[PDB]
């Protein structure tokens, strides 16, 4: 692919997301989604091979079905109230269809199956984009229509997402599928607090995005897509594996690391309403994500796996391309808890 | 080579000038017809108001005759909280008439070719 | 979530098409222009929570104009009673209704 | 929700203008030139009251003015008007352009007999002013009283008491 | 009374098609230094009747491998659409007066391709399939350019009503204003009717009979009649669009005579072109339509939007 | 200025269709901004009376509004007859 | 109503022509007569086998260019607006965008058929 | 009740939808979609939407021509399936027909809420407008307002179409 064409496609993806974020008209929001998908399909196919083509096809089918349901919900809402402005969604059937369409776009359970497959079928850069930038538009719409949400449906989907993310991640040796299941669980956490406080949703999204960016950038720096290939990195660059171990611990939600901050905050918010059983269940379930993060840390940093002879040659060369934002991303992923009250600036 | 291009360009320019003159004349004629319609509009509005009111009154009297059997039916009761005038839905003007008039009132203009 | 770029810059990217009571070409009015105008003026500035209760009458009138459910219910009741009366044979329907009416311009 | 007030049938009776569309179109310009005042009064009533039940007398006056206009036209130029409107009526689109001789004869007759001048192009489409003793309606929409707004934000901003007050943080 | 109008429209069109077959044969003969049909009937005037009687008393075949439903549906669709395409033509008054007659013709013309598509597919033979795919390619070649040319020409009419074209060309023919568009439209109508040099769906030398190779007797005659009716109809549309006859409301017969004469001239030009030139390759038709006609058509559409605004010559009837 | 002349000659010798298309498109783009009759087209569009002109209530302080269609006040279309 | 009657009349006439064609003449159908035609020799494969399309990219581009026709059709009515400058700017913008897309597909060998 | 024309057209619309949704073979699916496009054009025409109906019919005719070519190229088999050549396709078709007939009977003989709300029938003529004014078509004016009011829509639409051309070329580049 031409670099000019790649830049144009990335800019079109971002423009579709921005159009979703700045629009007041439902038609313009739908157009933003369409433009984002149209530009996103070729980016997933940048390195051409059958797996990338399969991932792109599955992604297109899922997102096109979601957009059809989105448009039908908009039209039903218009039928029962001649309104185009994104507001309290005057019809409940239309609101149910809207919620299901947005959940399918986000990959929330039980519309979760496509996320591990698409993530595994594409490159690490495409996976970074898909798991970070592609969450902004549906979450922005959900934040805008939160007051009309049905808490039962969204809470059911969020709890299912957390459970399924943990259970599915428990079974993986491929790093991209691990990241996808982690994303599913974190989306569940984000949507669990949405009917109560959208500021907490934004805070969780920001912290998750920072940690995911650090994770994907560390995985690109050490060209590993499997557990066994990541188990070699200690014999080439131990600093990368140590930073990865601390980042995994933060993603597990352990204090005093930054990944503990959202869950903590969310739990507190849920106890400001009554909502006692659900946060307890959510934390006990997030223990599963912590377990498979810890297994990855065992494989890559806390023990030393056997290496190969040809690795000696790799000792003689340095990394050519350097990521300028990786150190700041790591620091923000780990040492940010003491600045928790700054979340007031989010609302 | 040059002669053919020149002849074509001259033909195009002559056609452009003729069409400009004719289109301006047609615009003036349209303005005149629109002014005639504007002059005629108030009488049509008055007769339309009288026709609508007469149909509504006939429907009201017929409904008052019909619906006196039932216990709890207020005759001529509105369906709107507001007390201002609401344009009739045309299922209210032609609701008690033959299907020929209903067809002519609904699809008469669309089907006229 | 929503970055009100239009409000900050005063651009009007899409607000011209959000409602039916907003500056149509040739001043063509919507079928429910007055009802929507009244509901909007009632609900302006007080927030959605208060508007959902204090502007319920205007919204109900607007929805009745939009979908016309009660009007069809009333028309169906009248027609059913008339049909029963004629079937019993007591209706004695008028000439204008039957198409024998003296039309006016 | 209350009953709907409707005029009686007897109140809706008026002498009718029973000439076809071609006849009306053939005399449209002179009709708009002569009967302008009652028509403008009726249109102002119609657009201000927003209720057909409140401008019935104005409609009757419009009908009376049209009847007087057509009575005069019959009295002075029966034949030229008949020829002109027959010419207009033959056309499928009822076009002015195809019958100018008959229009010229009708115009000459009305000018000589009644001193009537056909309006120039763009004159009947003007926005005019009308003098009426009818009071301007105050609530033509029958609007309810608007709910009172949330009061306001007032006073000077002071730092938050003891900071954020979030768990153990003292700032 | 309206059914009488429908019959008086559709029966004379069929007779005109029948005798257009004879006229085309005789014109080709005399341009090829021969005579053509002059034996059965004086000057071959009974030849179309004999051809029709022979074709409708001949056994029709149902191929063993064919899909029978589509096989029978395709000629019915072709003939019915060809007859229907005539109803909005003002001569000077149309049978059906439409606000958007031009768009109606466009839609029905783009529907007519499925006759060839489905007949070729349902024949279940290789030559028919090749002909149907050539039809797909031909439509993809011409459709967009044809639509843009139509819009560019109608930017001076003011609407899509076909009768307004009579008043638009009251003083001058539209060809004097848009002769490049007229040329491209003429070539596009040659391509739209599958006529030489763009007769690729039949392709007699390459594909035997092409899409209708399995058809015989009456179903084949129906395809023939639909094709020739489309010829006459498209040339009548061109005559109305670019050479506007003067209409006197008290004497429509003069307009009818003038319009019929212009239509016959354009149809004879079609026959002349068939007799004069060799056949395109069907990729070359696509390249001609997409690399030469399309850019010029886009530029001329820009020019015909800009020109009425520049010269304050916008037509009426918003 | 000399190489582009050769480029134009070569384009005219190899792809005349594209040369004509680009010339026509450029003329169509740039000419309307240099014509004095575009505003005449705008005025003609504005002078077409699609809707009824609703009269204004006389408050006694509008000397620019005519009291009758034939009064000297109000807009004029006399510019349109000379076009 | 009239258009529906016209459609019914035309379809009925065509159907009656087919019926007459199939019921008037004498039929003698046998296996060799109804076999597929391939110029006197039996076909090797089936006509239902995949048939390669060499101009698939042009077909997709035709799908995309067909919607610009729907976008540009209302131009005769759009030319009657009061703000002619905005309308002309937007129409020229759309046509320039279409020309740019055609130029992009042309220069990247997109109009060439597959070999 | 008046001639049932709109109801008949909408029923044929649903029937064509069931025809292509049972997925016999893309040839017959395209035929069913063409039939649905035609009856939808008729439905929209009966409501005063001449331009929109004609436009949607033209667009879907072009789309189905491209789909026919692609079906011949890439979606064929030795024996293409019809609605009566396979038990799954026939079962889906019959189930769709019975579902439509049951819903029609339910909403016609009774007045009950299927999913959203209730419905009694009375024909679609009741909710019409009886609006008496105009030397123009309102739909034409609204659609033409795209070039004066919808500048933003024109911008985003044109950008999307150009991006679509670039996107299809990138996707089919292969390598
Ligand atoms: C050169 C350095 C310099 O210029 O010193 C000036 C500066 C003078 O400030 P000061 O007003 O005189 O300090 C008053 C007392 O220190 C006490 O000042 P204070 O009472 O205003 O406390 C400030 C306040 C707000 O300040 C903070 O929240 C940030 C403090 C960092 C937390 C420590 C974590 C790692 C170290 O801290 C807290 O609220 C306590 C929360 C800390 C827990 C953070 C959560 C993570 C869990 C633990 C892991 O000295 C310092 O900043 C202290 C060193 C740090
Ligand atoms: C509930 C409503 C159900 C609707 C039914 C549709 C009507 C067709 C039913 C009769 C056809 C079946 C007879 C047959 O196959 O051969 C008989 C018989 C058996 O031959 P065989 O050699 O022993 O064995 C043949 C094989 O078994 C296999 O033979 P095959 O390969 O020919 O089987 C395929 C055939 C067999 O049929 C089936 O597989 C099941 C039938 C269900 C089809 C419905 C699917 C939905 C499609 C869209 C909706 C269509 C309208 C429905 C609404 C109707 C109410 C108005 O399916 C079709 O081909 C469907 C064609 C009908 C669609 C007509 C559309 C016209 C297109 C015009 C363009 C549209 C413009 C825009 C609007 O052969 C004959 O007698 C000659 C052929 C008969 C053809 C007559 C005319 C064509 C059909 C009538 C169309 C009427 C349209 C109005
Ligand atoms: C270069 O060689 C060639 C020719 O030149 C010699 C041709 O002519 C030629 C064309 C084929 C010809 C032999 C013409 C054949 C004539 C038709 C097939 C018959 C069509 C005539 C009827 C079917 C029309 C309908 C008959 C009615 C009389 C019409 C009225 C309708 C009633 C209901 C009334 C071809 C393909 C050709 O290759
Ligand atoms: C231009 C378009 C419009 C034209 C207007 C006229 C339309 C004409 C109608 C279309 C059909 C044209 C074909 C006419 C030929 C006859 C075909 C058929 O009807 O006849 C026989 C139909 O008959 C059946 O075979 C059985 C006999 C009748 C069946 C009994 C049904 C019960 C009816 C009661 C009868 C009692 C007396 C009726 C008078 C009151 C079929 O026999 P078959 O050989 O296979 O087919 C080939 C015919 N051949 C021999 C001429 C070649
Ligand atoms: C800060 C960064 C700036 C650069 C990045 C900008 C990214 C967005 C791309 C273009 C900016 C959008 C702004 C234009 C919004 C359109 C509306 C506004 O401009 O007003 C219009 C003014 O129109 C003007 O002509 C401006 C439009 C011309 C736009 C030129 C095309 C530029 C787009 C190029 C980038 C887009 C994607 C790439 C495509 C090549 C209409 O005004 P008017 O008609 O009086 O009144 C309407 C109200 N009425 C109907 C009651 C009368
Ligand atoms: C008095 C001076 C006149 C000035 C006129 C303006 C400038 C005229 C010259 C500008 C460019 C002229 C054409 C381009 C240069 C020559 C053509 C060329 O580049 O190579 C030809 C080559 C085609 O040949 P092939 O298909 O590759 O042949 C294969 C078999 N051998 O061209 C190309 O590769 C790309 C062609 C792109 C066409 C552009 C698409 C359509 C755009 C025109 C529509 C209207 C435009 C209006 C908007 C622009 C306004 C300024
Ligand atoms: C005269 C006697 C009438 C008999 C009617 C029989 C009908 C029938 O289906 O028979 C099949 C018959 C003859 O088959 P055989 O048995 O081989 O020949 C018998 C001779 N020995 O086959 C046919 O001819 C088919 C008849 C055509 C069907 C007519 C109705 C179809 C309607 C088509 C609708 C689609 C129109 C598409 C265009 C519309 C789009 C706007
Ligand atoms: C197939 C597609 C049919 C398209 C028909 C289009 C006809 C048309 O465009 O004329 C519109 C015409 C006139 O309207 P205007 O021109 O806007 O002016 C009226 C004001 N004086 O409107 C009408 O009359 C509509 C009335 C009939 C609607 C058309 C119904 C046709 C439906 C086709 C379905 C086919 C049958 C179903 C089976 C499918 C095939 C087996
Ligand atoms: C003052 C401002 C005015 C603005 C400028 C306007 C003037 C512009 C002048 C130029 C207009 C010319 C229009 C011609 C359009 C296409 C011409 C063309 O170049 O096409 C040819 C080919 O076009 C054809 O020859 C058509 C092929 C089919 C022929 C079928 C029969 C021939 C026609 C017989 C006579 C038809 C008469 C047309 C009008 C009939 C009446 C309506 C391209 O093919 P090649 O030469 O191979 O080059 C491409 C590779 N470089």
Enter the DSSP assignment of D130. Answer: E
Helices A277-297/A151-169 angle, 10° precision: 20
Check if the beta carbon of residue F17 is closer than 8 Å to that of residue E289.
Answer: no
Enter the DSSP assignment of A234. Answer: G
CB contact under 8 A, E299 and F45: no
Check if the beta carbon of residue A192 is closer than 8 Å to that of residue A308.
Answer: no
3-state secondary structure string, D31-94?
Answer: HHHHCHHHHHHHHHHHHHHCCHHHCHHHHHHHHHHHHHHHHHHHHHHHHHHHHHHHHHHHCCCC
Q: Is the CB of E186 under 6 A from ligand 9?
A: yes
Dist CA D11 CA F59 (whole Å): 32
Dist CA A116 CA A62 (whole Å): 13
Task: Give the alpha-carbon dihedral of E158, E159, E161, E164, to 10 degrees.
Answer: -10
Check if the beta carbon of residue E231 is closer than 8 Å to that of residue E267.
Answer: yes
Angle at D26 (CA atoms; ends D24, D29), nearest 5 degrees: 90
Phi, psi of B53 (to 5 degrees): -65, -40
Residues near E285 by Cβ (< 8 Å), separated by ≥ 6? Answer: E137, E138, E141, E191, E198, E200
CB contact under 8 A, H66 and G60: yes
Enter the DSSP assignment of A174. Answer: B
Size of interface D-F (CB pairs under 8 A): 73
Residues near C1 by Cβ (< 8 Å), separated by ≥ 6? Answer: A21, A139, A140, A143, A144, A198, A202
Residue A258 burial (CB count, 10 A): 24
Dist CA D62 CA B42 (whole Å): 8
Identify which ligand lies nearest to the alpha carbon of E57: 4
Please give the span between the terminal C-alpha atoms of chain G, in angstroms, as a whole number.
Answer: 52
Closest CA relative to residue H130, chosen from C18, B91, A98: B91
Enter the DSSP assignment of E174. Answer: G
CB under 8 Å, gap of 24 or more: what pairs does F75-78 form? F75/D122, F75/D126, F75/F47, F76/D122, F77/B31, F77/D120, F77/D121, F77/D122, F77/F47, F78/D120
Going from the C-alpha of G4 to that of each of B109, E85, H55, the distances in angstroms are: 15, 14, 19
Total H helices, total E strands in chain A? 16, 0
Closest CA relative to residue H82, chosen from H33, H14, H32: H32
Residues near E84 by Cβ (< 8 Å), separated by ≥ 6? Answer: E108, G6, G7, G10
Q: Please report the DSSP string for F32-47 in residue order.
A: GGG-TTHHHHHHHHHT
Residues near C36 by Cβ (< 8 Å), separated by ≥ 6? Answer: A82, C19, C20, C21, C30, C62
Locus of tokens 């189930």:
H95
Q: Is the CB of G89 under 6 A from ligand 5?
A: yes
What the block records as the tokens of E121 is 């597919």
Cα of E180 from ligand 6 centre, angstroms: 19
Residues making up chain C, counted from first to last: 105
Pocket perturbation via mutation, ligand 8, pick of B104, B106, B107, B110 by most ligand atoms within 8 A of CB: B110
Phi, psi of D152 (to 5 degrees): 175, 170
Q: Which helix (H) or strand (E) holds F56?
A: strand F56-57
Going from the C-alpha of E216 to that of each of D36, D88, E72, E206, E314, the distances in angstroms are: 73, 56, 12, 19, 53
Dist CA A12 CA A5 (whole Å): 10
Dist CA E156 CA B43 (whole Å): 35
Dist CA E207 CA E200 (whole Å): 9
Dist CA A334 CA A327 (whole Å): 11
Beta bridge partners of E251: E248
Going from the C-alpha of D160 to that of each of D164, D170, G25, H10, the distances in angstroms are: 7, 12, 102, 64
Longest dimension (CA), chain E: 65
What 3-state DSSP class applies to A68? helix
Dist CA B60 CA B106 (whole Å): 22
Residues near A316 by Cβ (< 8 Å), separated by ≥ 6? Answer: none
Going from the C-alpha of G100 to that of each of A34, E127, H159, H162, H163, the distances in angstroms are: 22, 38, 11, 8, 11
- Chain E positions in Cβ-Cβ contact with residue B37 (cut-off 8 Å): none
Check if the beta carbon of residue A334 is closer than 8 Å to that of residue A248.
Answer: no
Pocket perturbation via mutation, ligand 4, pick of G13, G14, G18, G23 by most ligand atoms within 8 A of CB: G23
Q: Which of E156, E179, E316 sits opposite B27 (nearest CB)?
A: E316
Dist CA F74 CA E212 (whole Å): 70
Dist CA E51 CA E45 (whole Å): 11
Please give the span between the terminal C-alpha atoms of chain D, in angstroms, as a whole number.
Answer: 59
Check if the beta carbon of residue E193 is closer than 8 Å to that of residue E89.
Answer: no
Phi, psi of F57 (to 5 degrees): -75, 130
What the block records as the tokens of B8 is 């074509």
Closest CA relative to residue E228, chosen from E97, E72, E86: E86
What are the residue ranges of helices labelled H in chain E?
A: 2-31, 47-56, 68-84, 101-111, 113-123, 126-154, 164-168, 179-192, 204-207, 217-242, 252-276, 282-288, 294-310
Q: Please report the DSSP string for A235-299 in residue order.
A: GT-HHHHHHHHHHHHHHTT-TTSTTHHHHHHHHHHHHHSS--HHHHHHHHHHHHHHHHHHHHHII
Dist CA E110 CA A50 (whole Å): 37
- Chain H positions in Cβ-Cβ contact with residue E117 (cut-off 8 Å): 65, 68
Going from the C-alpha of G78 to that of each of B47, E161, E164, E314, G72, the distances in angstroms are: 34, 16, 18, 11, 10
Dist CA E296 CA E188 (whole Å): 14
Q: Which atom of ligand 8 is nearest to the CA of H137?
A: 17
Structural domain total, chain H: 1
Dist CA A258 CA A251 (whole Å): 8
Residues near B15 by Cβ (< 8 Å), separated by ≥ 6? Answer: E172, E176, E177, E178
Residues near F76 by Cβ (< 8 Å), separated by ≥ 6? Answer: D122
Helices E101-111/E68-84 angle, 10° precision: 160
Total H helices, total E strands in chain B? 2, 0
CB contact under 8 A, H167 and A28: no
Enter the DSSP assignment of F57. Answer: E
Domain containing H86 equals 5-173
3-state secondary structure string, A104-147?
Answer: HHHCCCCCCCHHHHHHHHCCHHHHHHHHHHHHHHHHHHHHHCHH
What the block records as the tokens of A261 is 């901050």
G window 47-86, beta carbon within 8 A of F: 80-85
Residues making up chain G, counted from first to last: 115
What the block records as the tokens of H123 is 């024909």
Interface probe with H: pick from C76, C77, C79, most Cβ of H within 10 Å: C76
What phi-psi label fits residue H86: left (phi over 0), alpha (psi between -120 and 50 degrees) or beta?
beta
Dist CA H54 CA F1 (whole Å): 51
Residue E197: is the preceding peptide bond cis (ω within 30°)?
yes
Dist CA E113 CA H159 (whole Å): 32
Enter the DSSP assignment of A162. Answer: H
What the block records as the tokens of G55 is 């101009």
Closest CA relative to residue A235, chosen from A222, A226, A252: A222
What 3-state DSSP class applies to E200? coil
Q: Which residues of B touch H (CB under 8 A)?
A: 34, 37, 44, 48, 87-91, 93, 95, 99, 102-103, 105-107, 110
Q: What was the experiment behind these coordinates?
A: cryo-EM
Enter the DSSP assignment of A214. Answer: H
Beta bridge partners of F56: D129
- By the 10 Å C-beta count (0-12 exposed, 13-18 middle, 19+ buried), A6 is classed as middle
Dist CA F22 CA F10 (whole Å): 15
Closest CA relative to residue F74, chosen from F50, F38, F37, F49: F49
Residue G79: is the preceding peptide bond cis (ω within 30°)?
no
Residue E67 burial (CB count, 10 A): 18
Return the residue whose CA atom lies nearest to atom 52 of ligand 4. G26
Q: Is the CB of E166 under 6 A from ligand 9?
A: no
Q: Is the CB of G3 under 6 A from ligand 8?
A: yes
Check if the beta carbon of residue A219 is closer than 8 Å to that of residue A190.
Answer: no
What the block records as the tokens of G45 is 């494969």
Cα of G15 from ligand 7 centre, angstroms: 7
Helices A124-132/A198-221 angle, 10° precision: 170
Beta bridge partners of A226: A174
3+ Cβ–Cβ pairs closer than 8 Å linking G and D: no
Residue A341 burial (CB count, 10 A): 14
Dist CA A288 CA A161 (whole Å): 13
Residue H77 burial (CB count, 10 A): 11
- By the 10 Å C-beta count (0-12 exposed, 13-18 middle, 19+ buried), E134 is classed as buried
- Is residue D2 less than 8 Å (CB to CB) from chain F? no
What the block records as the tokens of D37 is 């005042």
Dist CA A208 CA A262 (whole Å): 9
Q: Please report the DSSP string for E94-155 in residue order.
A: -SS--SSHHHHHHHHHHHTHHHHHHHHHHHTSHHHHHHHHHHHHHHHHHHHHHHHHHHHHHT
- Chain B positions in Cβ-Cβ contact with residue H136 (cut-off 8 Å): none
Which domains does chain G carry?
Answer: 1-108 (1.20.58.1610)
Q: What's H96's domain CATH number?
A: 1.20.120.1200
Size of interface B-E (CB pairs under 8 A): 49
Dist CA E36 CA E47 (whole Å): 11
Q: Which helix (H) or strand (E) holds D129?
A: strand D129-130
CB contact under 8 A, F46 and G92: no
């Amino acid at each position: 692919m031409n670099p000019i064409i790649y830049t144009t496609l990335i800019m079109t993806v971002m423009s579709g997301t921005m159009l979703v974020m700045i629009s007041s008209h439902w038609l313009l929001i739908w157009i933003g989604f369409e433009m984002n998908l149209l530009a996103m399909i070729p980016v997933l196919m940048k390195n051409f091979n059958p797996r990338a083509t399969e991932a792109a096809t599955k992604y297109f089918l899922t997102q096109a079905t979601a957009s059809m349901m989105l448009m039908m919900a908009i039209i039903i809402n218009l039928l029962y109230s001649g309104q185009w402005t994104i507001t309290k969604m005057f019809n409940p059937v239309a609101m149910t269809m809207m919620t299901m369409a947005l959940a399918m776009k986000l990959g929330l359970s039980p519309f979760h199956f496509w996320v591990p497959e698409v993530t595994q079928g594409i490159s690490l850069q495409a996976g970074l984009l898909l798991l970070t930038w592609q969450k902004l538009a549906p979450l922005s719409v959900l934040c805008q229509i939160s007051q009309s949400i049905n808490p039962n449906l969204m809470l059911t989907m969020a709890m299912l997402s957390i459970l399924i993310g943990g259970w599915g991640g428990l079974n993986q040796t491929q790093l991209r599928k691990i990241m996808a299941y982690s994303s599913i669980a974190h989306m569940g956490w984000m949507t669990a607090v949405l009917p109560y406080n959208t500021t907490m949703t934004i805070l969780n999204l920001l912290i998750y995005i920072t940690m995911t960016l650090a994770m994907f950038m560390l995985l690109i720096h050490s060209s590993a897509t499997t557990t066994l290939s990541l188990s070699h990195t200690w014999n080439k660059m131990p600093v990368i594996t140590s930073l990865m171990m601390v980042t995994l611990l933060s993603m597990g939600g352990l204090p005093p690391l930054s990944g503990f901050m959202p869950k903590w905050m969310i739990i507190q918010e849920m106890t400001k309403n009554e909502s006692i059983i659900m946060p307890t269940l959510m934390a006990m379930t997030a223990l599963l994500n912590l377990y498979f993060y810890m297994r990855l840390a065992y494989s890559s940093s806390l023990t030393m796996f056997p290496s190969t002879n040809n690795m000696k040659m790799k000792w003689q060369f340095e990394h050519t391309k350097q990521m300028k934002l990786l150190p700041t991303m790591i620091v923000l992923s780990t040492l940010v808890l003491p600045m928790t009250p700054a979340l007031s600036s989010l609302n | 080579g040059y002669s053919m291009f020149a002849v074509g360009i001259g033909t195009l320019l002559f056609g452009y000038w003729s069409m400009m003159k004719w289109n301006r004349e047609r615009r003036r004629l349209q303005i005149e017809d629109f002014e005639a319609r504007i002059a005629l509009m108030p009488l049509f509005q008055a007769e339309k108001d009288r026709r609508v009111l007469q149909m509504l009154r006939e429907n009201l009297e017929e409904e008052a005759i019909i619906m006196k059997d039932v216990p709890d039916w207020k005759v001529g009761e509105s369906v709107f909280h507001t007390t201002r005038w609401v344009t009739p839905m045309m299922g209210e003007l032609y609701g008690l008439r033959t299907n020929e008039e209903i067809l002519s009132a609904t699809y008469g203009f669309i089907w006229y070719t | 979530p929503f970055f009100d770029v239009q409000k900050r810059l005063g651009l009007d990217l899409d607000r011209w098409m959000t409602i039916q009571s907003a500056e149509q070409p040739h001043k063509i009015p919507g079928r429910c222009h007055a009802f929507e105008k009244e509901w909007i003026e009632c609900a302006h500035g007080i927030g959605g929570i208060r508007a959902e209760k204090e502007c319920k009458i205007e919204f109900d009138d607007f929805v009745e104009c939009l979908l016309r459910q009660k009007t069809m219910k009333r028309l169906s009741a009248i027609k059913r009673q008339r049909d029963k009366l004629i079937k019993e044979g007591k209706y004695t329907p008028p000439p204008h209704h039957l198409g024998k009416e003296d039309p006016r311009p | 929700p209350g009953i709907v007030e409707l005029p009686t049938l007897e109140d809706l009776k008026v002498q009718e203008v029973k000439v076809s569309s071609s006849v009306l179109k053939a005399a449209a310009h002179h009709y708009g030139a002569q009967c302008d005042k009652p028509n403008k009064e009726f249109m102002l009533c119609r657009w201000e009251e927003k209720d057909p039940r409140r401008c019935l007398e104005e409609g009757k006056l419009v009908n009376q003015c049209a009847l007087d206009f057509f009575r005069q036209i019959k009295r002075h130029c029966a034949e030229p008007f008949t020829e002109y409107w027959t010419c207009i009526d033959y056309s499928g689109l009822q076009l002015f352009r195809h019958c100018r001789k008959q229009q010229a004869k009708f115009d000459e007759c009305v000018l000589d007999k009644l001193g009537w001048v056909r309006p120039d192009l763009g004159e009947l489409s003007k926005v005019t002013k009308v003098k009426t003793d009818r009071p301007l309606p105050e609530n033509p929409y029958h609007s309810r009283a608007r709910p009172e707004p949330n009061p306001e934000a007032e006073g000077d901003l002071k730092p938050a008491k003891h900071g954020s007050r979030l768990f153990f943080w003292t700032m | 009374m309206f059914m009488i109008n429908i019959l008086s429209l559709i029966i004379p069109i069929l007779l005109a098609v029948a005798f257009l077959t004879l006229v085309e044969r005789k014109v080709l003969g005399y341009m090829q230094l021969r005579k053509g049909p002059n034996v059965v009937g004086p000057y071959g005037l009974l030849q179309p009747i004999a051809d029709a009687l022979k074709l409708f008393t001949k056994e029709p075949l149902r191929p063993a491998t064919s899909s029978i439903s589509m096989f029978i549906i395709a000629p019915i669709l072709a003939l019915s659409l060809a007859l229907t395409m005539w109803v909005p033509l003002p001569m000077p008054y149309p049978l059906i007066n439409m606000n958007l007659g031009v768009l109606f013709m466009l839609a029905m013309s783009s529907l007519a391709v499925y006759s060839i598509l489905w007949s070729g597919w349902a024949s279940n033979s290789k030559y028919a399939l090749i002909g149907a795919l050539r039809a797909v390619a031909q439509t993809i070649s011409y459709e967009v350019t044809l639509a843009i040319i139509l819009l560019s020409v109608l930017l001076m009419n003011g609407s899509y009503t076909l009768s307004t074209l009579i008043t638009t060309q009251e003083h001058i023919w539209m060809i004097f204003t848009s002769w490049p568009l007229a040329m491209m439209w003429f070539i596009s109508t040659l391509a739209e009717t599958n006529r030489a040099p763009f007769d690729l769906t039949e392709g007699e030398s390459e594909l035997v009979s092409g899409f209708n190779v399995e058809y015989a007797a009456g179903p084949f005659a129906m395809f023939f009649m639909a094709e020739y009716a489309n010829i006459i109809m498209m040339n009548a549309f061109t005559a109305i669009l670019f050479l506007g006859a003067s209409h006197d409301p008290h004497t429509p017969e003069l307009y009818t005579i003038n319009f019929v004469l212009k239509t016959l001239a354009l149809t004879i030009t079609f026959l002349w072109i068939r007799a004069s030139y060799p056949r395109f390759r069907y990729d070359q038709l696509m390249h001609l339509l997409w690399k030469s006609f399309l850019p010029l058509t886009l530029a001329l559409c820009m020019w015909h939007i800009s020109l009425p605004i520049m010269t304050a010559s916008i037509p009426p009837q918003s | 200025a000399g190489r582009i002349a050769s480029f134009l000659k070569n384009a005219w010798a190899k792809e005349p269709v594209l040369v004509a298309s680009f010339a026509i498109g450029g003329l169509a783009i740039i000419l309307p901004s240099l014509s004095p009759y575009t505003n005449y087209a705008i005025r003609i569009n504005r002078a077409t009376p699609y809707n009824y002109p609703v009269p204004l209530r006389d408050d006694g302080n509008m000397p620019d509004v005519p009291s009758h269609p034939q009064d000297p006040q109000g807009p004029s279309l006399e510019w349109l007859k000379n076009l | 109503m009239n258009i529906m009657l016209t459609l019914l009349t035309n379809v009925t006439l065509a159907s009656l022509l087919v019926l007459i064609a199939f019921w008037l003449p004498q039929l003698n159908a046998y296996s060799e007569k109804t076999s597929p035609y391939e110029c006197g020799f039996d076909p090797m494969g089936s006509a239902r086998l995949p048939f390669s399309m060499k101009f698939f990219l042009v077909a997709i581009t035709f799908l995309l260019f067909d919607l610009e026709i729907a976008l540009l059709l209302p131009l005769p009515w759009a030319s009657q607006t009061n703000n002619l400058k905005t309308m002309l700017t937007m129409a020229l913008f759309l046509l320039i965008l279409l020309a740019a897309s055609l130029a992009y597909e042309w220069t990247q060998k997109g109009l060439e058929w597959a070999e | 009740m008046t001639m049932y024309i709109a109801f008949i057209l909408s029923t044929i619309f649903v029937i064509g939808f069931v025809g292509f949704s049972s997925k016999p073979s893309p040839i017959y699916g395209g035929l069913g979609l063409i039939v649905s496009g035609g009856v939808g054009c008729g439905i929209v025409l009966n409501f005063g939407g001449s331009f929109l109906g004609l436009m949607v019919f033209l667009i879907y005719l072009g789309g189905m021509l491209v789909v026919f070519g692609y079906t011949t190229a890439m979606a064929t088999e030795m024996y293409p399936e019809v609605w009566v050549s396979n038990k799954t396709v026939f079962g889906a078709f019959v189930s769709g027909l019975m579902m439509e007939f049951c819903m029609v009977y339910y909403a016609l003989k009774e007045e009950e809420v299927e999913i959203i709300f209730k419905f009694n029938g009375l024909g679609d003529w009741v909710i019409y407008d009886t609006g008496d004014s105009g030397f123009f078509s309102e739909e034409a004016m609204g659609i033409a307002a795209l070039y004066s009011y919808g500048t933003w829509l024109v911008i985003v639409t044109g950008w999307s179409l150009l991006i679509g051309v670039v996107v299809i070329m990138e996707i089919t580049r292969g390598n």
